[PDB]
Amino acid sequence: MLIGLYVLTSGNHRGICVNRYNPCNRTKEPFFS
Amino acid sequence: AEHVRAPSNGKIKFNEDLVHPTRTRHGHPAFLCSIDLYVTIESEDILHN
Amino acid sequence: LSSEYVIYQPEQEEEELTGYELDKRLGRPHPFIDPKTKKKIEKPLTSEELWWNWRKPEKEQWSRWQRRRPDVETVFLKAMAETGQVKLYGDHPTLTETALYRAR
Amino acid sequence: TATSISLGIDDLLTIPSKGWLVQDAEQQSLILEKHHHYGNVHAVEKLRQSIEIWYATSEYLRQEMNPNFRMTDPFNPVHIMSFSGARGNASQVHQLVGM
Amino acid sequence: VFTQGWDSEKIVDYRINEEEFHKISLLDCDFFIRKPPDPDNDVYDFREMYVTPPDTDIYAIPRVLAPMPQKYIRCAMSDYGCYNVTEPPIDAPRDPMYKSEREVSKVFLTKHYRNRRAGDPEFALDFEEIYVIDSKTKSITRAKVVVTVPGGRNRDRKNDLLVIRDNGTSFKIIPSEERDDPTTVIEKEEWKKSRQDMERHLRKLRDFSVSNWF
Structure with missing residues (x-):
């Protein structure tokens, strides 16, 4: 249960691990109501 | 218990006048500081103290 | 009439002329240390001059860690250095490059 | 169940620098053992150095294990099992992946 | 009554009627700028300003580090801060599990274009004249x-x-x-x-x- 909760609330990568080049040169999922 | 380690590769520069000669428990030659000293690590780009 | 608290700079353009800074800002393959900036350290104390504990042996000793540990990261780094996807400093990937590839 | 976490052989990761620490430790141990035979040091010192030059080396490895996991492979299954508190302990993990 | 005194930061030896001032609450301070009568209460007058610790009657002169307007100007306020959600102790059968605070740190006063009203068909804002209000230094300066x-x-x-x-x-x-x-x-x-x-x-x-670095 702790492993499941940790995988749920862990998230994912946010910086150099999700984008290769710097985002300063150049959309996300639509706004879910 | 706590062992100070080198941040990066380079040369260790410190003034040997404030440090007094000693012998480690492990038998190696060494220097003992009874006062605060600032060592510099002359690395490729930056320094460390 | 414009006070010091207001500054007019129409069409302000800021760019890096040198290739190293451009590759560092964009994120392209570039060395960690600028070869321009790199400056050789003056000669350190010779092995003879060091105390015995730090002296290096005259004969190269044997060890079970003399050979590099094979990993999947090295094979993949070589495979992607071929065909021109990434650029590596040298023909063999080093440990820092493998550690960086493990993240990206 | 949806994620199906699992631990593998290659999944166990060692700190990038281990071949260096062990190599310098064993080199210092050799230099000592040579000198012991020459009369430059005494057994108590040899005994002491051996234990210490080894304990310090090991701890560098253990303390460094967590940063490596969080910085390089964040979602490593062994790291997930250890950090979440589900199974294992830092000491157990160290024995599996360090020394 | 229009009154101006020395720049020394101390008490004014009297109390002011807060009905003729704007109360802009901050984290550790609160400011008072005089308000001339108007349909929409947005006309300020930076000739008289007072600083006071939160919920106190000890008035004082703030620190001015920029030339202030000596005329009635129409401005709009906008706060700049960060919410602080804390986990309070629970010693009750239905004690709140969380606590939320705004914790404002800076207040921006953007002067309107040509002192026009908001209801004007051609309304605009003048960004070249913005006055910040710091809460840690009790200072009111201009925006470069x-x-x-x-x-x-x-x-x-x-x-x-x-x-x-x-x-x-x-x-x-x-x-x-x-x-x-x-x-x-x-x-x-x-x-x-x-x-x-x-x-x-x-x-x-x-x-x-x-x-x-690849």
Whole structure:
């Protein structure tokens, strides 16, 4: 249960691990109501 | 218990006048500081103290 | 009439002329240390001059860690250095490059 | 169940620098053992150095294990099992992946 | 009554009627600027200003570090802070599990264009005249705005966008066409911080300075 909760609330990568080049040169999922 | 380690590769520069000669428990030659000293690590780009 | 608290700079353009800074800002393959900036350290104390504990042996000793540990990261780094996807400093990937590839 | 976490052989990761620490430790141990035979040091010192030059080396490895996991492979299954508190302990993990 | 005194930071030896002032509450301070009568209460007068600890009657003269307007100007207020959610102790059968506070730190006063009313069919805002109100230093200064947009003064002030960065210390006026979506700037800052952290971690290896960042 702790492993499941940790995988749920862990998230994912946010910086150099999700984008290769710097985002300063150049959309996300639509706004879910 | 706590062992100070080198941040990066380079040369260790410190003034040997404030440090007094000693012998480690492990038998190696060494220097003992009874006062605060600032060592510099002359690395490729930056320094460390 | 414009006070010091207001500054007019129409069409302000800021760019890096040198290739190293451009590759560092964009994120392209570039060395960690600028070869321009790199400056050789003056000669350190010779092995003879060091105390015995730090002296290096005259004969190269044997060890079970003399050979590099094979990993999947090295094979993949070589495979992607071929065909021109990434650029590596040298023909063999080093440990820092493998550690960086493990993240990206 | 949806994620199906699992631990593998290659999944166990060692700190990038281990071949260096062990190599310098064993080199210092050799230099000592040579000198012991020459009369430059005494057994108590040899005994002491051996234990210490080894304990310090090991701890560098253990303390460094967590940063490596969080910085390089964040979602490593062994790291997930250890950090979440589900199974294992830092000491157990160290024995599996360090020394 | 219009009264002005010395710049020394101490009590004024009397109390003022707060009905003729604007109460702008901050984290550790609160300010009072005189309000002339008006239909919509937005006309300020920076000739008289008083600082006071939160919920107190000890009035004092604040620290002025910029030339202040000596005329009735119409402005709009905008707070700049960060919410602080804490986990309070639970010693009750239905004690609240969380506590929320706004914790404002800076207040921006943007002067309207030509002192026009909000109901005017052609309304605009003047970003070249912005007065910040600090809460840690009890100071009220001006904003060193950097107007970077082609057109000069002849350009109509209806296509503009003030971008505030660096903890409310950097101001830039850019057209609304070259704006950046929130995800873009979020990813930019995250990428910069992550790259800095990664270079720190790796700098402590012996194979550095002979490596490449791919």
